[PDB]
């Protein structure tokens, strides 16, 4: 509920701003899709866009040491919890050999995770998120879904 670490998650629960959201980093050869998906009431699309976009921007300009350690910790946990039993590991062997050419050992993933301070997050986020044109897909009761120009406008901060 209200006590959740993530600002978007906490505001979304408190103000009943959605039924769900999820971040993603879909990977392809030399390209991919990076952002969020959410499902919400017809009247809640605008606030949801605002609160999410503002989060991308907060992180792009003003990410902090503590929250970045949490993100590192969630990832360490995500990576270890995922590689549990023969089916996930065999999948990781097959996929990694096609996409990386080798199997990247868990110690190396940790090494590459441990490297990521706040300065890294806001630089890397800026490279991809800051002042970029999004791909937007909308379905359902979408009268309140922001106009593209306004979404595009939420991709930068006038304050920064």
């Amino acid at each position: 509920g209200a006590h959740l670490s993530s600002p978007l998650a906490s505001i979304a629960a408190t103000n009943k701003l959605c039924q769900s959201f999820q971040t993603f980093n879909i990977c392809y050869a030399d390209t991919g899709l990076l952002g969020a998906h959410f499902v919400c009431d017809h009247m809640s699309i605008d606030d949801m866009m605002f609160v999410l976009q503002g989060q991308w921007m907060r992180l792009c300009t003003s990410a902090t040491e503590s929250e970045v350690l949490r993100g590192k910790n969630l990832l360490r946990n995500a990576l270890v919890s995922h590689l549990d039993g023969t089916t996930p590991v065999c999948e990781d062997i097959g996929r990694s050999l096609l996409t990386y050419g080798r199997r990247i050992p868990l110690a190396e993933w940790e090494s590459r995770i441990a490297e990521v301070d706040a300065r890294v997050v806001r630089e890397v986020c800026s490279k991809y998120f800051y002042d970029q044109c999004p791909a937007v897909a909308g379905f359902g009761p979408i009268e309140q879904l922001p106009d593209y120009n306004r979404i595009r406008s939420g991709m930068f901060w006038l304050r920064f």
Binding site: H42, M43, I45, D46, C133, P141, E143, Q144, Y148, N149, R152
Partner: protein
């Protein structure tokens, strides 16, 4: 006052849009533009012009008749 999300019921309509940074502002400015203005002039000249042409005649005659009224050839 009404806001978005409370306006009306719309079903089964897909809108495809492009970012302004991916597309040009003046796509075919003169090539598509010039034919279009001529087309909508043609579509309206029969409704807009015939009152003005009528005023022009009532103006041109009126001004002419005003000048040639004070002067007189016999005493």
């Amino acid at each position: 006052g009404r806001q978005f999300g409370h306006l009306t019921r719309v079903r089964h309509v897909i809108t495809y849009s492009l970012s302004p940074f991916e597309q040009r502002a003046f796509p075919h400015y003169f090539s598509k533009g010039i034919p279009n203005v001529l087309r909508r002039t043609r579509a309206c000249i029969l409704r807009v012009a015939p009152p003005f042409v009528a005023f022009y005649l009532v103006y041109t005659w009126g001004t002419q008749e005003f000048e040639k009224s004070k002067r007189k050839n016999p005493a």
